[PDB]
C-alpha cells in the first residue's frame, strides 16, 4: 500500500529558507494524513470498480484527487528540495533558455503565476513531450499536473510556509529557489526526454 | 458490465411532446455511446487502481464522472416518462404541497432553474433522507446530484429538444410535465423515505 | 471607496480561543490586501463596462469576485466574533430546533462540513428567505455565499488557524463556537426575516 | 449597446457543410439571444458598480461571463467561415508547420480535442503574445480562451451541428475545414503579432 516515503534530508537542513517546524509538520502531519487516507480511499474505489457499484465509484472521485494528488505532489516536493541543490545540467538550462530566454525569465514567470494562486495551489516547471518544450502550469488544491511530466513543483498551500512567512507568500516563492534541488530536476528533465 | 437498458416504451410513444426520432437518437445513439465509453473507462479505472497508478487513475475521473453520469441520468430519465403517467402518490403530493405549497409552484420553479442552465445539463426533483424534504437542482453536463436521492429529471441538453423544439428550450421544459411519470417518481419518493 | 472597517474587539480579546497574532494579521495583512486590491479592480471593473471593453470585464472577473468576496466575508467574520457573545435569541433558537434538531446537532453539522472542505473556503450558517429555512453551506476560496442571507461564518483558509492550531483544523473549528457573537448572529436573524 | 453583427454571408451560403436552418437559428435565435442578455445584464452590472453593491455584482458574473462570451465567439465565428476561404498566409503556414509540423497535424488535433469536449463548448487555434508561438485549445460552453488571442473557433454546442449531423459530431469537425476562412484567420494572425 501507498507509504509516507522518509525525507532526504533532515528537518532543520533547509533553513533558513524552511523551517525545521514547517517541514516537520508538512511531512509528519499533512503528507501523512494524505496517504492515510489515500490508502482508505483506494482501497474502497477498487471494491466500488469491481463490484460496478457506480454512483459510490464517482462519489469517491474527489476523495482521491484531493489525497491522491496530496501523495504525488507531496512525493515530488520532497525530492525537488536540498540544502545544496546545484545547478541545472547544461542539456537543462540550454532548454530553459531556449523556451523562456533565461533561468531569470523562468524563474520570475513561475513565480509570479505560482504567487497568483487564488486560495490553495501549486505551481509547476513541467515538460511536455508532444510539443517537447518546458511550460509553467498552475494547479488548484491537490488536482495533479496534467499534460505534461513534472520537474519542479512550488507547494503555495499556507502550510507551506505560513509559520514562518507569515501572509509573505511572495517571499516564501522567491527564496525556495534558493534550495531547488536542481540535481534532481535535473534527472527528472532527461527521464521525460527518453 | 453495464448494459443499455431497453425503454419502457416504443420511441414513438411519447409525441407529440418528445419526438420519435429524438427517442430513437436519444436511446440508441446517445445512451448507447455513453454506456460503451463508461465499459472502457471502467476497464481503464479498474486496471490503473489493481497496479498504483494513481496518476492515471486521477486522469480517468472525467471521463468516469462524465460517461457513468450520462448512464445514470438516462437510465433515470426513461423510467420517468410516460404517456399514462398518473398522479403522485397522496403522500408525494402531500410532500409537495408542505415543501413548495403546491405541485403548480414546484413545476414552475423547476421549470424555470432547468430553462436557465447555461450550456448542457439537467434540472432534477430529489428527496434529502437527512432533512426529510424535497428539493431541486441543477447540474451541469451529467455531474452527479448531491446529497439528495433523484426522484424526477428533465434533461436540457439540446439533443434532447433541438429536432423538435429548436432553440425554444421553455416549450419543451414546459411541455414535459404532460409526459413526468408520476408512477414511478412516487415509487422513487417511497424508496428514498425507506 | 472601499475600507478596512475596524475591529469591534481589541487584537487579544479573542484569546486563547484565536491568538492576538492571528488577529492582527488577519485584520492588518489580509483584509487590508483584499480592500486595496478590491478598489483597484472595481475602478478597472467600472472602466471597463462603461466603455463595453468587453473582454477585459470579464478578465477583471476573478479577481473582483476574490477580493470582493475576501471584504465581504472578513468584513461578517469579524462582527461574528466576541470574547462573550451571550446566546443565541429566542426566536433564532426556536429555528436552530426546528430546522436542524438542536443547536448541537446545527453545530456538529456545520463543523463537519467546514471540517471537510479541501483547501481553503468558508462554512456558512444561513437562512434562505425563500423556502423560509436556516440552511448550512461551504464556499471556496472566497466565493460570497449565495442563495441565502448570510448569519455565522467560519474562515478555514489555514491562515485563519494555523499558527495556533498549525494542523488541526478541527479543533479550531469546534472552538470557534466558544466566541461566536450570538448577539450580531441573532441580529442577522431577525434582519434576514424582515 | 452591443448589436448583432450581420453575417458576412447568406445563411445557405455554406451549404451542404452547414446548412441554411442551422445558420438562420444559429444567427438569428441564438446569437441575438446572448446580444439581448448581454446588454441587460450589462446594465445591472453598471448599476451594480455604481452603487457599490459588490454582492449583486458577483452575482452577474456567471451570467456576464456567459453572454458576452456568446456574443465574443459567435462574432469571431462568423467571420471564420467562408465559401471560399482561400489558404493561410505564407507566414501563417509557416508558422503552422513550426509549431504543429504540419497543417495536416493542426486539423487533426485541434479536431480531436474538439470532437473530445464534454458537453458544450469550443475548439480554438490561438497565437500566444508572450512566447510567440500557436496553440490548441478547448472552452467549456462560451468561456474565455485565456492567454491567447483567438484565430480561429470551432463550435461544438449542439445546436451548432444537430438539425444537419445528428449525434455525429465528428462529421461536423472534420467537415468544417473546408470552409474554414484563412483570409480572416490570417488576417488575425498578422493582427496579433503586432
Ligand atoms: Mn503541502
Ligand atoms: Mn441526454
Ligand atoms: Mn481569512
Ligand atoms: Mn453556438
Known sequence: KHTLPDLPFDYADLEPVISH???????????????NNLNQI????????????????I??????????????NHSIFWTNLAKDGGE???????????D??????????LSDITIAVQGSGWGWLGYCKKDKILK???????????????????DVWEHAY??????????????IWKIANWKNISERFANARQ
Chains 1, 2, 3, 4 share one sequence.
Open 162 to 175: 505560513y509559520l514562518q512567512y507569515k501572509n509573505v507568500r511572495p517571499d516564501y516563492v522567491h527564496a
Open 136 to 154: 509553467i502550469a498552475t494547479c488548484a488544491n491537490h488536482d495533479p499536473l496534467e499534460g505534461m511530466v513534472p520537474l519542479f513543483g512550488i
Open 21 to 35: 517546524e514547517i517541514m516537520q509538520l508538512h511531512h509528519q502531519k499533512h503528507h501523512a494524513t494524505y496517504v
Open 88 to 98: 541545472p545540467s547544461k542539456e537543462l538550462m540550454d532548454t530553459i533558455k531556449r
Open 100 to 109: 523562456f530566454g533565461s533561468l531569470d525569465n523562468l524563474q520570475k514567470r
Open 42 to 57: 483506494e482501497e474502497k474505489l477498487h471494491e466500488a470498480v469491481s463490484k460496478g457499484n457506480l454512483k459510490e465509484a
Open 59 to 72: 462519489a469517491l472521485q474527489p476523495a482521491l484527487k484531493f489525497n491522491g494528488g496530496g501523495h504525488i
